Structures are given as C-alpha cells and as structure tokens.
Amino acid sequence: ARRLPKPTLQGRLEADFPDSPLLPKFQELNQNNLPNDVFREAQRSYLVFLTSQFCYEEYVQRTFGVPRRQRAID
Amino acid sequence: ARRLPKPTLQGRLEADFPDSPLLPKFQELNQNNLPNDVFREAQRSYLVFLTSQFCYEEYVQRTFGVPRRQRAID
Amino acid sequence: AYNGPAFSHHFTRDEDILDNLENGTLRDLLEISDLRPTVGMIRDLSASF
C-alpha cells in the first residue's frame, strides 16, 4: 500500500551542467495527466534510466572486442 | 565421432600484417575442393604451423650460437 | 599462435603481451591467471607444436 522513504539528493544536475548529450531525448513526456509533485519522480526515474542506457551502451562499447585489431599497423 | 568445439580467434591476421615473410608460403592450398568453413580453419591451422616453423627456426639458429667471438674482438 | 604479437615476429621480445594481443581465448585465459609472460617466451610455446 506504501513504500520506502525517498533519498535526499541535493542539487539539480540539469541546471549546472548543460553540455551533456541526450538533451532532445528528454521531452517525449506527458504533463497534463499528472501534477508536478509526482512528475518529479516520473522525471527522476527517467533520467537514471536514460543515463543507464547511455553508460550501459558505452560499457558494451568498451567490452565487446576490447583491443583493436587494426592498431597493429601503427 | 566428434571433437572439441572451436575457440574464438577473431578476425584475420593475414588481412592485418603485410610484413610477414611467410605470406608467400601461405597460398599453396586450394579453395574449390572443400567448403568455406573447413577451408577457413585450414588456413588458420596452416598459418599457425608456419608460425611454429618460424618460431623454432628463429630459436634454433639463435640459441645454437648466442655467444660469438667475432663481435667480441672489436 | 593465431594471436597478434607472437605472429608478427617484428613486435620485439621484452615488452608486455597483454596490451598488444586481441580478445581471444588467450586473453581471458591470461586475465583470470594474471601473469605477464613477455613475447618471445610465448614463441617457443608456439614452436613446440
């Protein structure tokens, strides 16, 4: 019926660091169905998911075939 | 009846190293008398047999005469 | 012997083998073992075949 208390998490990351990618990957959300106090959680859970896809993608970018075969030319 | 499965052995080392002196001693096998995969692993095994030949040949002329007097004169 | 640095014979002896080999079975075989045999002393392991 209920859950666990939410963390404190001081600081807004979008308002200080603006040169991050996936910035047009953010506005495909609804706003007239839910108020702002629950859309804050619907946005926070989305941003961790977005950077989780991004960091997972660069992880498998590293850890696919880890060295380079064509590097032996130089 | 069967053997072990094959290890990974990614890419091609013929298509990376143009400075191999064994490269003329490689293409003396025929393609059309067998399918592609067994011919591929046959080129793998022939390449590593030539690499073993070259490794033993650069060893056995090395450690036969690793001391010499002619450098030791001047 | 189908690995990178032991096949070239112009990558020299007294260097690391972990940096210049590809992600073959020797690569993850040498990760969990974690030893650093140089190139050239792996060449006679190739040469015994």
Decide: residue A28, CB within 10 A, 0-12 exposed, 13-18 middle, 19+ buried. exposed
Selection from C33, A34, C10 nearest residue B21 by Cα: C10
Does the beta carbon of B41 lie under 8 angstroms from any beta carbon of chain C? no
Q: Under an 8 A CB cutoff, do C7 and B47 touch?
A: yes
Reduced to 3 states (helix: H, G, I; strand: E, B; else coil), residue B6 is coil
Q: Under an 8 A CB cutoff, do C47 and B55 touch?
A: yes
Alpha-carbon span B63 to B74, nearest angstrom: 22
Reduced to 3 states (helix: H, G, I; strand: E, B; else coil), residue A7 is coil
- Identify how the structure was determined: cryo-EM
Alpha-carbon span C44 to C2, nearest angstrom: 14
Find out whether B11 and A69 touch, Cβ atoms under 8 Å.
Answer: yes
Selection from A50, A58, A44 nearest residue A23 by Cα: A50
Q: Which chains touch C (3 or more CB pairs under 8 A)?
A: A, B
